[PDB]
Design a protein around this ligand. Structure first.
Ligand SMILES: *[C@@](C)(CO)[C@](*)(O)[C@H](CC(C)C)NC(=O)[C@H](Cc1ccccc1)NC(=O)[C@H](CC(C)C)NC(=O)[C@H](CCc1ccccc1)NC(=O)CN1CCOCC1
Ligand SMILES: [Mg+2]
Lengths: 250, 233, 240, 235, 222, 244, 212, 231
């Protein structure tokens, strides 16, 4: 018995390709489109809620996840792989940072920790790479707002705006035309909804779209009062109603 | 390192011509408190062995389970489990003796004094002692605790050496045991009147007697005893 | 832990992984060892496809294991560091327990034992390295020169070469080296070592390294100009 | 590929059988047992004339009363000898006596099959273990990588083994003297060796009750070589 | 606090002759002021003409004897039924005892038999394995009573030749099996008189080339 | 069992080569070119970012050039994720040395240990090697300014000027042509950029597709300063040498 | 115990008593306190009997394994250091050993190493170890010269043990003498104190404190 | 074919080829015979040599005073298994003061051999064993196969040409079973049985190996001049 697979399942081919990473990226290509846009006073991340069945309650399945009060994440590719990454990403934010420094990690460093986990699945024994690409939007005091992409290889790049998955090629072209360095948060949400309509085929409403922002602090969402320095989470998930309001003036 | 909590007092025993007798009272003492009165401290293993246990009762109950499990394990893949390959007293003893010494050697003893009484397959009488230290010894009469101090002297007047064993009948031997139990009730502060007695004979087999009582006691002379020296009333 | 038996026997009775490790040694730059009457000289090739090198800081081919023993090699450079490190530690460990530095035979035997262990341990490949170990035993003036190889066998040599085109330079040494009368002086020993490398090297510029070891921890590496003088002298005598 | 501890359809362990082929490539080693002692002799086989032949150590001491000769991948023998020496000394420590030659051989052969997926492969070397004890007297054992050992009156291992063994079959008798045995090893070695036999490329050794295990000098062997040539020309 | 040791009393005695050796020991087993058994043997035939006794804490004594007996068995398996010599047995026992150097067997061990020249041999061990071959050794509770008597009667210590002005010592000589058994019996009756833990019975094991014989004698039971 | 699926990453070819190391080098040859040039009064590190997108955040980005300590930096060529694993190890190793000896780690010692780690992955463990080649640029008070390179084999060598990644063959020829020993930092800066400008697979070399760094003694009196160039600083140095 | 060994012109003298005690109980008068490690190495034994006897026997096995592996007799320094490094591993565990490793080799010459159970290892010319070491020192030091003859050196060693055997209650039995030369160790007999004391008293005229 | 790479693989017809190949190693081994009466149990073994200069490979191993076996196949595997039996016999003595039953001895060997046939990495034992013994239920003879299958028998034989001796014993069953209180006659029957497996060679003094155990007879082995009586 016991795990006898102590050897790498990802290896270099004669041409220099790492097959399993390439194939993992292929799985991401098949995945549903998701995107992220960075504004001057915030960041938006969005994706389509591809429902497996109309009997299924798509509210229970959350593609956009809170990692820290000021950091959020969305993906394209294999959902189960994403779910367990979110679990590990949330825990590592505490164990390797918050329990040491008494504060949440900055976006770039949490991203670095997630990348490390995905890199190890590329080299460690008896495992395949994760079949997802992540988009991590976040804020912190000294770096401000930021947006990062994380690939199956463990590589991560900062973006002004980008898209991943099914119709990423067309979506990235659309974002190049619309993006400028003076975009306000509401303008970025508007562009996000326009970009996403191109890739979505069926219904396009607040129930089939999942969208969250990293913006101003939300004292109402904190849950308590009495500490002035604690001002609430910058991560907010837009409601089904809040999306539909912006779809009328589209 | 332990300290015994609920405890059992003397276990007494002796050999006679055709077998062995063993006895022990039915008390589970909690220090000076005579807490439990329905405790059986003689445990039969098969139809040819009886293990009498004194000392810590929690550890006694553990040993019960081991012996119970030993019978089960012996029956596995053993067509002659109730015949030639049945459990002998000598097997049961050596097993316990091994455990007792292993536990003392790990500084975590089973806080007990044990006497394994029985009859072997060839008819020979078996009687041997083992305790928390792993110390073992055999004798025509064996006793634990206060029994060693008070019972043995009385039982040795009947069977003083090996040659006295064929000369001792089951009637004479049981009488001495029952007498010893009475003496222990007079003099051991952690003893009870109620006790159990077991006879393992090579002919008549295992006879297990429950709910016996100490009787024919002498207390009348107490009425004449007044004061502690001078007092006359 | 990774357990796979990588070094194993084949139908014809060969351990291919050990034999392929020898091919790596054959690819490596040439190294030569010649021992004289009162000294040992270690010569080493350096390939000249690498210009713009920094020779100050580039790892030297000959390594000191202790103040009285040196180790050169042919084969995989990265592998050689692991053997050298282990040897250096064992050299200090010997001094600590025996209160006496290692003999050249003992140090060789240790290194050879490490190489052997990697030929029948699970999860590891053999070292792609053959070594020339040279020096002088404590309070002894007899020169010592030993060779090791990936299989783990080791032996003493009056003179020996390893690496690429080593069969050419071994041919040279076999007729030019006299057992009855070895190089009597340091100069004679160095010259014979340089001559032997000049059969293979190319140019005698910054391609040849020479290290001379003498008794009582007397080791020194020759500079370019010092070596170039031997090259200039040999070529003038050759034209005859 | 395939498992290391795999059986062939004929009922043999592949790796053990392949290690035996490696031993056939090794240099020749011969052992002869007599009532006056046991003689061990080996072919050194230097790969080049520059190699100092005295550094070729293919005959080895295990204890004062036990010697050992090897053939095959000789590097593999180092840990086998190390084990044998420790086993021999350890037994003397535990029992204040010399250890039986058979018991020593058995201890070495217990390592043999401790391979699989323990070490990664069998040993690629065969050993001739010679010795003496009070019980069974002078003994010669052949220890293989299969874990098996046979006692022998005489035995050859290595490249010229089958030719040398057939020669030992005819020449051996129960009344051989030590001197007769010495010459017989030299004679048979000279027959199966590629290069011409002399004191530098061949080595002799013996084990006697009185003087224990001794490797002969190159001066002593040279005289036995000269004595051998003269006796063959004498008829 | 739990005390893993105990004192089971008793005493043992080994004497070596020219072609024989005896190992005696009383059969009384005790704890504190109580008698456990009047006949509990502690001198054992272990095979290969080796007799052994490990007096002191009986549980440790039995454990040791048990382990040595087992050591003899495995010596046969591993070395082609070779006879374990008395000198080899002794060294083996040292390693058994010293193996528990930091949690010792609380016993004085004595073994007896014949050496490889056929001569009588007695070895004695401390609790942690130091051993020594001797002509004579008493061990256990009454060792201090018996041993000086043995020095005087076996090794003729402090005895000089009459009329030689204390210049010539009484010459050493081997004792007959008859004379040795007389000394053993007198040693144990004397020890029984003056030591409370000694009595009940005396069991002697005699070792010759022919085998291991036994003799038993009654001792005072008070 | 699992034997069936084992690639056997740590074995020799019949020719005596390590398959995986060779294939890892083939991987690295497609990575963006990185150049290191050592001058008498400092060191230059220049690297080309891999085909940049216009929406990539350039100023808050780190792909090629990383800082190991105050005195040592590295240029990367290969898998970035792999490099970061090794970089954090190297950073820790430097701090262990400082903690032990109260002295900054000598460059070679750091390089050796990092190269020894790579070597381990080629000889044992059954894992794939790190698909990374480093250019180490650093200073210590023993050897002064030093350039090294290491590759997946775990073999390291010292250099006066060196390139890794793509088009090293063409890049090394150009460096060998124009390099000389009495060179200054400012001249080395110009050489590094000119070399990339000619060897690049892009149409034209621009500020947004570069990472640049220098290690000078240009601080105040006998102390070393590490300058990781900002986007605007690369834009200026590119105009100043007349490439754009 | 009382044990000594001193270095002089003609090699090394080693002398020991033969008593063994368990408290005030004299357990043995015939203990061998010199271990013969090989023809050129001796070891003395003082302290715990089992500790000394077991570990010095073990030392002899390690010295044998050295000469099998290295084809050369172990140095006195290396032999003593094997023992000292061993006992150091057991430091605090309660080992009780006061030993002296005495022998000759070509490279070292005659050499004596004091090794004890708390890890002390000392090279030196003169050492006395045991409960009666001070009594031995008193006689040995006051009569020691480097230029002693083999005959006089043997006697001084014997006389020094005798002195300690007399005064120290935990020393006695008999004196075991050894002489170590370039050719190896030579045994110089067992000398019972019972006869030796009176023989020395009469011939030397010493021990005037005792009733003659 | 494709299903004989290791022991963990079943063939399409439900066979374990590595176990069968281990069984094949026994068939190549030298013949050995086992038989018993009610009072005694006997092992007879034909020993094999490398050549005339070599010794004859010892086939019989003692396990306890009342139990032992003969081997056929890989001798080192017999050493491992016999050693395990020695320990189990010994454990029964030290802990329970009880001689190990020959039936339990078989059960323990079966379970040890089985574990090697269900796990990756390991291999089956390459040896067959004939265990004899005398316990509390009289004389016994067992046949161990490395597949795990242990079988109690009156008589049997394993090794090369073992079918000849096995047929003879099947005919002689009624005769030799009643050889009670007579060791030499039970051996004679075993020696005559093994003779039915001989070809070209005959039983010599340093070739034959006999062992016996019984009511008042400890397990003892006879070799050399001690077996000259039975030729
Ligand atoms: C001089 C003579 C005295 O100091 C020497 O130093 C000699 C050295 C010689 C023997 C090599 N030392 C002793 O004789 C030594 C003194 C000693 C004792 C105990 C601890 C340290 C030093 N004596 C012994 O070692 C005796 C020798 C026996 C009696 C032959 N052994 C014991 O006393 C043993 C073992 C002691 C022990 C050590 C470590 C752990 C556990 C036990 N103890 C007993 O036998 C106990 N006791 C003796 C009285 O009878 C009942 C049991
Ligand atoms: Mg009394």
């Amino acid at each position: 018995m016991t795990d006898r697979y102590s050897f790498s399942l990802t290896t270099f081919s004669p041409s220099g390709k790492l097959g399993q990473i390439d194939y993992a990226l292929t799985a991401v290509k098949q995945g549903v489109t998701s995107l992220g846009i960075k504004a001057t006073n915030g960041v938006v991340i969005a994706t389509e809620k591809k429902s497996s069945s109309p009997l299924a309650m798509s509210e229970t399945l959350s593609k956009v996840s809170l990692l820290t009060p000021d950091i959020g994440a969305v993906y394209s590719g294999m959902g189960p792989d994403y779910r367990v990454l979110v679990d590990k990403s949330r825990k590592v934010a505490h164990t390797s940072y918050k329990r040491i420094y008494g504060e949440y990690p900055p976006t770039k460093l949490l991203v670095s920790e997630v990348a490390k986990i995905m890199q190890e699945a590329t080299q460690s024994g008896g495992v395949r790479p994760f079949g997802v690409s992540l988009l991590i939007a976040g804020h912190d005091e000294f770096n401000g707002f930021s947006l990062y992409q994380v690939d199956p290889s463990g590589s991560y790049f900062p973006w002004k705006a980008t898209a991943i998955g099914k119709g990423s090629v067309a979506a990235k072209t659309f974002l190049e035309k619309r993006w400028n360095d003076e975009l306000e948060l509401e303008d970025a949400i508007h562009i996000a909804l326009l970009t996403l309509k191109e890739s979505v085929e069926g219904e396009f409403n607040g129930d089939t779209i999942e969208l969250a922002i990293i913006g101003d602090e939300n004292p109402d969402l904190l849950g308590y009062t009495g500490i002035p320095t604690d001002k609430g989470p910058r991560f907010r998930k837009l409601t089904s109603q809040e999306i539909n309001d912006r779809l009328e003036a589209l | 390192t332990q300290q015994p909590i609920v405890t059992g007092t003397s276990v007494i025993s002796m050999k006679y011509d055709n077998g062995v007798i063993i006895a022990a009272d039915n008390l589970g003492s909690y220090g000076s408190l005579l807490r439990f009165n329905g405790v059986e401290r003689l445990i039969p293993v098969g139809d040819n062995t009886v293990v009498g246990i004194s000392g810590d009762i929690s550890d006694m109950q553990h040993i019960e389970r081991l012996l119970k499990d030993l019978v089960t394990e012996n029956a596995y893949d053993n067509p002659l489990a109730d015949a030639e390959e049945a459990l002998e007293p000598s097997y049961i003893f050596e097993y316990l003796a091994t455990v007792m010494y292993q536990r003392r050697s790990k500084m975590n003893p089973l806080w007990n004094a044990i006497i394994v009484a029985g009859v072997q397959s060839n008819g020979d009488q078996f009687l041997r002692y083992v305790n928390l230290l792993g110390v073992t010894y055999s004798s025509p009469t064996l006793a634990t605790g206060f029994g060693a101090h008070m019972a043995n002297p009385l039982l040795r007047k009947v069977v003083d050496r090996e040659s006295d064993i064929p000369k001792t009948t089951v009637q004479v031997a049981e009488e001495a045991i029952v007498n010893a139990m009475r003496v222990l009730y007079y003099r051991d502060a952690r003893s009870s009147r109620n006790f159990s007695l077991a006879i393992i004979d090579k002919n008549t087999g295992l006879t297990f007697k429950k709910n016996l009582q100490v009787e024919n006691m002498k207390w009348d002379f107490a009425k004449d005893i007044k004061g502690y020296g001078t007092q006359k009333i | 832990g990774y357990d796979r038996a990588l070094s194993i026997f084949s139908p014809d009775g060969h351990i291919f992984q050990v034999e392929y490790a020898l091919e790596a040694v054959k690819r490596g730059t040439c190294a030569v060892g010649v021992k004289g009457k009162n000294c040992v000289v270690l010569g080493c090739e350096r390939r000249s496809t690498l210009k713009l090198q920094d020779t100050r800081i580039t790892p030297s081919k000959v390594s000191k294991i202790d103040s009285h023993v040196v180790l050169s090699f042919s084969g995989l450079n990265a592998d050689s560091r692991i053997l050298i490190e282990k040897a250096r530690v064992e050299a200090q460990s010997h001094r600590l327990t025996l209160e006496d530095p290692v003999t050249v035979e003992y140090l060789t035997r240790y290194v050879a034992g490490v190489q052997q262990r990697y030929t029948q341990s699970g999860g590891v490949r053999p070292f792609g390295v053959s070594t020339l170990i040279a020096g002088f035993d404590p309070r002894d003036d007899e020169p010592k020169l030993y060779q090791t190889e990936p299989s783990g066998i080791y032996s003493s040599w009056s003179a020996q070469t390893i690496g690429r085109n080593s069969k050419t330079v071994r041919e040279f040494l076999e007729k030019n080296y006299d057992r009855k009368e070895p190089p009597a002086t340091v100069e004679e020993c160095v010259k014979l070592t340089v001559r032997s490398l000049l059969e293979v090297v190319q140019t005698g510029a910054k391609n040849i390294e020479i290290t001379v070891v003498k008794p009582d921890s007397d080791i020194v590496a020759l500079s370019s100009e010092e070596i170039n003088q031997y090259v200039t002298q040999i070529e003038q005598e050759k034209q005859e | 590929d395939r498992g290391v501890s795999t059986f062939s359809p004929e009922g043999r362990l592949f790796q053990v059988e392949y290690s035996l082929e490696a031993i056939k490539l090794g240099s020749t080693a011969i052992g002869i047992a007599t009532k006056e002692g046991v003689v061990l002799g080996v072919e050194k086989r230097a790969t080049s004339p520059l190699l100092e032949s005295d550094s070729i150590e293919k005959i080895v001491e295990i204890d004062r009363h036990i010697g050992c000769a090897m053939s095959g991948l000789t590097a593999d023998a180092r840990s086998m000898i190390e084990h044998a020496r420790t086993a021999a000394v350890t037994h003397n420590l535990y029992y204040d006596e010399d250890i039986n030659v058979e018991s020593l051989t058995q201890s070495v052969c217990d390592l043999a099959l401790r391979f699989g997926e323990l070490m990664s492969r069998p040993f690629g070397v065969a050993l001739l273990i010679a010795g003496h004890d009070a019980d069974d007297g002078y003994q010669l054992f052949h220890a293989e990588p299969s874990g098996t050992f046979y006692r022998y009156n005489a035995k050859a291992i290595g490249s010229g083994s089958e030719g040398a063994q057939a020669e030992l079959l005819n020449e051996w008798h129960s009344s051989l003297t030590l001197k007769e045995a010495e010459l017989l090893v030299l004679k048979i070695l000279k027959q199966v060796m590629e290069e011409k036999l002399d004191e530098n490329n061949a080595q002799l050794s013996c084990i006697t009750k009185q003087d224990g295990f001794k490797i002969y000098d190159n001066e002593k062997t040279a005289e036995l070589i000269k004595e051998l040539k003269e006796k063959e020309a004498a008829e | 606090q739990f005390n893993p040791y105990g004192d089971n009393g008793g005493t043992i005695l080994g004497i070596a002759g020219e072609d024989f050796a005896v190992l005696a020991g009383d059969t009384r087993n005790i704890t504190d002021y109580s008698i456990n058994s009047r006949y509990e043997p502690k001198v054992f035939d272990c095979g290969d003409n080796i007799v052994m006794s490990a007096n002191g804490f009986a549980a440790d004594g039995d454990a040791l004897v048990k382990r040595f007996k087992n050591s003899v068995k495995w010596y046969h398996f591993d070395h082609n039924d070779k006879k374990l010599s008395i000198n080899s047995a002794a060294r083996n026992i040292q390693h058994l005892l010293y193996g528990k150097r930091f949690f010792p067997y609380y016993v004085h061990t004595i073994i007896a038999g014949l050496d490889e020249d056929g001569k009588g041999a007695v070895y004695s061990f401390d609790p942690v394995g130091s051993y020594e071959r001797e002509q004579c050794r008493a061990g256990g509770a009454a060792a201090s009573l018996i041993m000086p008597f043995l020095d005087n009667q076996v090794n003729f210590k402090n005895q000089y030749e009459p009329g030689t002005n204390g210049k010539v010592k009484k010459p050493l000589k081997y004792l007959s099996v008859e004379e040795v058994i007389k000394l053993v019996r007198d040693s144990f009756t004397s020890a029984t008189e003056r030591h409370i833990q000694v009595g009940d019975g005396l069991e002697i094991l005699i070792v010759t080339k022919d085998g291991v014989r036994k003799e038993f004698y009654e001792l005072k039971r008070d | 069992g699992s034997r069936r699926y084992d690639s056997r990453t740590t074995i020799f070819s019949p020719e005596g080569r390590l398959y995986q190391v060779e294939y890892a080098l083939e991987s690295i040859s497609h990575a963006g070119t990185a150049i290191g040039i050592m001058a008498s009064d400092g060191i230059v590190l220049a690297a080309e970012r891999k085909v940049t997108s216009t929406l990539l955040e350039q100023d808050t980005s780190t792909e090629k050039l990383y800082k190991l300590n105050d005195k040592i930096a590295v240029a990367v060529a290969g898998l970035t994720a792999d490099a970061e694993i090794l970089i954090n190890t190297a950073r820790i190793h430097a701090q262990n040395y400082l903690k032990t000896y109260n002295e900054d780690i000598p460059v070679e010692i750091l390089v050796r240990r990092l190269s020894d780690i790579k070597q381990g992955y080629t000889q044992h463990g059954g894992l794939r090697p790190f698909g990374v080649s480093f250019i180490y640029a650093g200073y210590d008070d023993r050897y002064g300014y030093q350039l090294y390179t290491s590759n997946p084999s775990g073999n390291y060598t010292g250099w006066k000027a060196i390139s890794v990644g793509a088009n090293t063959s063409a890049a090394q020829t150009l460096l060998q042509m124009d390099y000389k020993d009495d060179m200054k930092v400012d001249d080395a800066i110009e050489l590094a950029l000119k070399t990339l400008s000619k060897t690049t697979d892009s149409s034209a070399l621009t500020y947004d597709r570069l990472e640049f760094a220098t290690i000078r003694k240009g601080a105040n009196d006998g102390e070393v300063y590490q300058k990781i160039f900002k986007p605007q600083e690369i834009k200026d140095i590119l105009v100043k040498t007349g490439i754009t | 115990t009382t044990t000594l060994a001193f270095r002089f012109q003609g090699g090394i003298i080693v002398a020991v008593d033969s008593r063994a005690t368990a408290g005030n109980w004299v357990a043995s008068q015939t203990v061998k306190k010199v271990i013969e490690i090989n023809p050129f190495l001796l070891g003395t034994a003082a302290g715990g009997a089992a500790d000394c006897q077991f570990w010095e026997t073990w030392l002899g096995s390690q010295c044998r394994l050295h000469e099998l592996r290295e084809k050369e007799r172990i140095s006195v320094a290396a032999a003593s250091k094997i023992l000292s490094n061993l006992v150091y591993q057991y430091k605090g565990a309660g080992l009780s050993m006061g030993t002296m490793i005495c022998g000759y080799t070509r490279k070292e010459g005659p050499t004596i190493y004091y090794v004890d159970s708390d890890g002390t290892r000392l090279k030196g010319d003169i050492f006395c170890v045991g409960s009666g070491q001070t009594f031995a020192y008193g006689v040995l030091d006051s009569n020691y010269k480097w230029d002693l003859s083999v005959e006089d050196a043997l006697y001084l060693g014997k006389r020094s043990i005798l002195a300690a055997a007399h005064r120290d209650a935990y020393s006695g039995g008999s004196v075991n003498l050894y002489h170590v030369t370039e050719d190896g160790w030579i045994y110089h007999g067992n000398h019972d104190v019972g006869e030796l004391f009176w023989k020395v008293k009469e011939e030397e005229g010493s021990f005037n404190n005792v009733i003659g | 074919n494709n299903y004989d790479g290791d022991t963990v693989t079943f063939s399409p017809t439900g066979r374990l080829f590595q176990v069968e190949y281990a069984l094949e190693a026994i068939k190549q081994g030298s013949v050995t015979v086992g038989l018993r009466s009610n009072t005694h149990a006997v092992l007879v073994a034909l020993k094999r040599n490398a050549d005339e200069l070599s010794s004859y490979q010892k086939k019989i191993i003692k396990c306890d005073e009342h139990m032992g076996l003969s081997l056929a196949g890989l001798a080192p595997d017999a050493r491992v298994l016999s050693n395990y039996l020695r320990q189990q016999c010994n454990y029964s003595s030290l802990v329970f003061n009880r001689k190990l039953a020959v039936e339990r001895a078989g059960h323990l060997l079966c379970d040890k051999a089985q574990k090697n046939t269900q796990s990756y990495g390991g291999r089956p034992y390459g040896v067959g064993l004939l265990i004899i013994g005398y316990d509390k239920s009289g004389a016994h003879l067992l046949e161990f196969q490395p597949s795990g299958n242990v079988t109690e028998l009156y008589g049997t034989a394993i090794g090369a040409r073992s079918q000849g001796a096995k047929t003879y014993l099947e005919r002689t069953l009624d005769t030799f079973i009643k050889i009670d209180g007579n060791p030499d006659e039970l051996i004679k029957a075993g020696v005559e049985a093994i003779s039915q497996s001989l070809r070209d060679e005959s039983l010599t003094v340093d070739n034959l190996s006999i062992a016996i155990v019984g009511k008042d007879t400890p397990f003892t082995i006879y070799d050399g001049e001690a077996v000259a009586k039975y030729i």
